[PDB]
Design a protein around this ligand. Sequence first.
Ligand SMILES: O=c1ccn([C@@H]2O[C@H](COP(=O)(O)OP(=O)(O)O[C@H]3O[C@H](CO)[C@@H](O)[C@H](O)[C@H]3O)[C@@H](O)[C@H]2O)c(=O)[nH]1
Ligand SMILES: O=c1ccn([C@@H]2O[C@H](COP(=O)(O)OP(=O)(O)O[C@H]3O[C@H](CO)[C@@H](O)[C@H](O)[C@H]3O)[C@@H](O)[C@H]2O)c(=O)[nH]1
Ligand SMILES: [Mn+2]
Ligand SMILES: [Mn+2]
Lengths: 288, 288
Amino acid sequence: AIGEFMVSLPRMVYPQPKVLTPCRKDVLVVTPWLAPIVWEGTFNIDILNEQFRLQNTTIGLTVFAIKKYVAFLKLFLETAEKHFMVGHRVHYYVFTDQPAAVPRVTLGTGRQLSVLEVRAYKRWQDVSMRRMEMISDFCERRFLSEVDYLVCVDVDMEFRDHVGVEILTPLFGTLHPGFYGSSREAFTYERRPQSQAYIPKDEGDFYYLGGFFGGSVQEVQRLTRACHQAMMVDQANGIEAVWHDESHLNKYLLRHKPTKVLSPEYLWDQQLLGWPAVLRKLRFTAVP
Amino acid sequence: AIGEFMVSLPRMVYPQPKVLTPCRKDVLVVTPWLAPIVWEGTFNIDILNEQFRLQNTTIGLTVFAIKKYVAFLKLFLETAEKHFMVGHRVHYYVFTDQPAAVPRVTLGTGRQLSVLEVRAYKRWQDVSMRRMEMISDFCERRFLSEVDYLVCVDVDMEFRDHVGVEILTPLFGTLHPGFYGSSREAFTYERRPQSQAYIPKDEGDFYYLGGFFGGSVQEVQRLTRACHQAMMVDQANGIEAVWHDESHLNKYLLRHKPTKVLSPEYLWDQQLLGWPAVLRKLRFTAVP
Ligand SMILES: O=c1ccn([C@@H]2O[C@H](COP(=O)(O)OP(=O)(O)O[C@H]3O[C@H](CO)[C@@H](O)[C@H](O)[C@H]3O)[C@@H](O)[C@H]2O)c(=O)[nH]1
Ligand SMILES: O=c1ccn([C@@H]2O[C@H](COP(=O)(O)OP(=O)(O)O[C@H]3O[C@H](CO)[C@@H](O)[C@H](O)[C@H]3O)[C@@H](O)[C@H]2O)c(=O)[nH]1
Ligand SMILES: [Mn+2]
Ligand SMILES: [Mn+2]
């Protein structure tokens, strides 16, 4: 459940947070609208695990594996079992055009997987851009009845380290690993005013990923519905945003500020970007 | 309103938050449970003003002025007009045993004041400790119908600088100005196991004030009800916590983590503690 009566935490022994010591001085850990930016060293996972277990939190994870991308499911799911929300209730929703190609993966207790068959689109960009519709339109009643939060990710990825309840909040985006140190003028936002995804050069907080976002079911429904509607407008106007769904997600999060922002620990490409000092953990990474 | 459909922010021009620059490196700006700690330089008030105005947020401010403390009302209210939630809807609730001693203070538009008459208790500690009852028991229906957030403060104080929507959240406490740099063993928590307010020497995050707390109406009701019940238990057991309501508030916030923590900018005593470098603003201060 979300927003139900919260029982008392039990006694816990852990290090005192010291006000005149930040652990992290090398990075911004809170946005100017007072949303935490989630980096290693900013959270005590034992406290968070307590808070979310006391709510009997259920997390839905959506992943699309259409056409050749079914090959990525085994590693995705097996590593999610090792690292994603372990100890909490998890419901995986695998959207595919090939139900029989979904690997038989052994799940820990309190975890379930549903295979949802969908149509395959011919163009790569329609496959990637139509996920907003599939999440909002077709699955709205399902998700509202079955989970408290939704986490929506790309499949060509593996978990290498803890991804847990520290991410959960009404609405979150993830800092793109290519651009976290860039100034806003260099962000690859949609720059044509004819697109609903247009962001002027003097606007923008961060460059967020299309590949890792989430929140409460209600907020994820809102985001995906708004992005779908905006993509339909662009289509009717004969324009396709430069980075597809990612461009629309950026416009949405500019105008609807996320209540947490995930650091690039949460979606990294080691082959392309290495392992910088400012990354203490690589949690979820692109498959080479 | 809280938690209603959030309209889009308008275009805004403001400095980009840079991920590899914290403004504040001298202080902890997020708790280990991912609640922001509110210091100057952590928030863009223009963004926050937008978000809360788009919700037509109404803030209730409670203040007790019993017996000789009515003398503090003029300065309290006049300075609140200059600095507290300016531009937002505000409802002051002044609890007093002397309605005719409440000064006639001129209010800005969209701001109102209600005088609530209460009984005066003979002991200083009963006056201070009975506010939990008065906030919860008698005023619950009133507040739920009239405001979105409640801010509950001591009266022997004045506003000197901005106190605004950056503080608003489901539940907040304020770091006591005497103890923000102390280790937890030095905190003046109730240490007798016979009191409901008991906190062992190896527990505790922060030392919070009895004099400045708040949150949503629902969360403030929960806090004040729980503290009132705990104080009644202690009374029945013939024990009175060392720092009265403040001791019980500390126990509650240990077991129910606040969703924001206010820095000591928000309740300071300059005569006793001066003006440290780590305080960029003194917002709300003790009257000498
Ligand atoms: O034939 C396809 C094509 C796409 N997908 C799904 O769509 C995702 C996105 O495609 P991908 O090839 O992973 O895109 P990338 O170029 O790796 O990532 C960019 O493009 C994605 C789609 O716009 C965004 O989610 C990312 O943030 C952005 O960095 C995939 O992981 C799959 O889950 C399929 O299942 N089958
Ligand atoms: O005769 C009284 C006594 C108390 N009060 C009210 O209660 C408040 C608390 O009393 P105060 O004398 O301000 O207590 P302090 O010793 O200044 O403050 C400590 O005691 C308060 C009561 O426990 C806590 O709120 C503070 O956090 C704590 O630092 C006052 O400001 C008034 O609002 C009255 O109106 N009349
Ligand atoms: Mn990918
Ligand atoms: Mn006082």
